[PDB]
Design a protein around this ligand. Structure first.
Ligand SMILES: *[C@@H]1O[C@H](CO)[C@@H](O[C@@H]2O[C@H](CO)[C@@H](O)[C@H](O)[C@H]2NC(C)=O)[C@H](O)[C@H]1NC(C)=O
Ligand SMILES: *[C@@H]1O[C@H](CO)[C@@H](O[C@@H]2O[C@H](CO)[C@@H](O)[C@H](O)[C@H]2NC(C)=O)[C@H](O)[C@H]1NC(C)=O
Ligand SMILES: *[C@@H]1O[C@H](CO)[C@@H](O[C@@H]2O[C@H](CO)[C@@H](O)[C@H](O)[C@H]2NC(C)=O)[C@H](O)[C@H]1NC(C)=O
Ligand SMILES: *[C@@H]1O[C@H](CO)[C@@H](O[C@@H]2O[C@H](CO)[C@@H](O)[C@H](O)[C@H]2NC(C)=O)[C@H](O)[C@H]1NC(C)=O
Ligand SMILES: *[C@@H]1O[C@H](CO)[C@@H](O[C@@H]2O[C@H](CO)[C@@H](O)[C@H](O)[C@H]2NC(C)=O)[C@H](O)[C@H]1NC(C)=O
Ligand SMILES: *[C@@H]1O[C@H](CO)[C@@H](O)[C@H](O)[C@H]1NC(C)=O
Lengths: 50, 106, 170
């Protein structure tokens, strides 16, 4: 299929209307970031020549 | 930068070769329409919100904080006066309460 | 197409697999980069049909209905001003979809300010939003409201100068 970017949301803009929240959600989200790699050492003489 | 929404705090967690951040954020919800105005015209003076916004539920005007609905009476203390009502486009007429008025009334 | 060359090439091992894997990683990385930059909203916001923004003109940055590509005049100018076993893979996001993402971001930031980036899109009049931005930089709301026509004229003039500067500089 042809992918859809997102659901359409037409914001009701007018010159004298505002939308004020009456409630809130305490949302906890996860962010995973790599920090380090496996520390690998290669003996060049032993790798090439044994 | 620290999660989706208005960031409140974050908690670090160790992970194999990595870190996991638990971002605690504040998300607005249950929004409601209100009629808004840039300024309030009272006694030939223009009043602007100090820290909030003017909202109207249909018949009465209040000033509330931008991120949560908490209507309060438009007083002298929470508004600042700058100029008359002839300059600001879209200014509406409403009374501005004075908390000093009952003190000298009594 | 030489069989003998491929037979000799097999003596060198998995070099070809390494090179193909690295190129594939770069190719998927470019699409990931485009997703990270442009696909930051899951709602496709649209502007109201009446462009009443309190004197602010956004015609040079909003999409042009007359153009088949649905691009802005600035975006159209930008696209006009940029000119043996090898294959070029198409990007995952086409130009019209990227333009649609930019249009959604523009509609969100015009009709809702910064609210759409932190949660549900909350409508606000554009002068009031500009006043909030003025308060962010330490200038009172009254300055914005009193000089609204001047600020709108300056903004329109600056946007026009941006279009002229892009069209006039190689
Ligand atoms: C704001 O939303 C919260 C949702 O967390 C509402 O809390 C719920 O209220 C209902 C009605 O009494 C309860 O049945 C739920 O158990 C509550 N949920 C929690 C997590 O406590 C809250 O009432 C809403 N407030 C307003 C003013 O709409
Ligand atoms: C604020 O008012 C506007 C205008 O009445 C509402 O926008 C309409 O909402 C209805 C209900 O779903 C839709 O059928 C219309 O298509 C909407 N119009 C537009 C231009 O989008 C809006 O929903 C109201 N917001 C709140 C929070 O009540
Ligand atoms: C807007 O909010 C105000 C403040 O709550 C409403 O005024 C109250 O209305 C109730 C119901 O008639 C009365 O019992 C209260 O005494 C009123 N308070 C004051 C200070 O007058 C007002 O009715 C609301 N308007 C709408 C359209 O909902
Ligand atoms: C808000 O109050 C002002 C102040 O009275 C109103 O301006 C008056 O409008 C009438 C009708 O045109 C004129 O006869 C007066 O001379 C005006 N007075 C001033 C000081 O300008 C204004 O019309 C009111 N607005 C609303 C919507 O009620
Ligand atoms: C916003 O700015 C655009 C571009 O400057 C205005 O469009 C011009 O309108 C005049 C008069 O109608 C035409 O002669 C020009 O050819 C138009 N230019 C373009 C590029 O279309 C537009 O009128 C301004 N105002 C609004 C409300 O959109
Ligand atoms: C909003 O626009 C209408 C006409 O479309 C106008 O009559 C009204 O005064 C405007 N309100 C503000 C606050 O600009």
């Amino acid at each position: 299929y042809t992918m859809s970017l997102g659901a359409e949301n037409s914001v009701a803009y007018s010159n004298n209307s505002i939308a004020i929240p009456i409630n809130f959600t305490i949302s906890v989200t996860t962010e995973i970031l790599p920090v380090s790699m496996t520390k690998t050492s290669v003996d060049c003489t032993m790798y090439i020549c044994g | 930068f620290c999660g989706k929404g208005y960031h409140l705090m974050s908690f670090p967690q160790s992970a194999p070769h990595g870190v996991v951040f638990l971002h605690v954020t504040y998300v607005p919800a249950q929004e409601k329409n209100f009629t808004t105005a840039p300024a309030i015209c009272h006694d030939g003076k223009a009043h602007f919100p100090r820290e909030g916004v003017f909202v109207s539920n249909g018949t009465h005007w209040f000033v509330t904080q931008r991120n949560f609905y908490e209507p309060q009476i438009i007083t002298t203390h929470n508004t600042f006066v700058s100029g008359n009502c002839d300059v600001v486009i879209g200014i509406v007429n409403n009374t501005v309460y004075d908390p000093l008025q009952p003190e000298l009334d009594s | 197409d030489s069989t003998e060359c491929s037979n000799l090439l097999l003596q060198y091992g998995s070099f070809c697999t390494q090179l193909n894997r690295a190129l594939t990683g770069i190719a998927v990385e470019q699409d990931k980069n485009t997703q990270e930059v442009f696909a930051q909203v899951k709602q496709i916001y649209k502007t109201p049909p009446i462009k009443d923004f309190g004197g602010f003109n956004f015609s040079q940055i909003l999409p042009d209905p007359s153009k088949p590509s649905k691009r802005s005049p600035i975006e159209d100018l930008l696209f006009n001003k940029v000119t043996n076993g090898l294959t070029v893979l198409p990007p995952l996001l086409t130009d019209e979809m990227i333009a649609q993402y930019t249009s959604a971001l523009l509609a969100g930031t015009i009709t809702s300010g910064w609210t759409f980036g932190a949660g549900p899109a909350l409508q606000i009049p554009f002068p009031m939003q500009m006043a909030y931005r003025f308060n962010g930089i330490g200038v009172t709301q009254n300055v914005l409201y009193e000089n609204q026509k001047l600020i709108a004229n300056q903004f329109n003039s600056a946007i026009g100068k941006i279009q002229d500067s892009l069209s006039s500089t190689p």
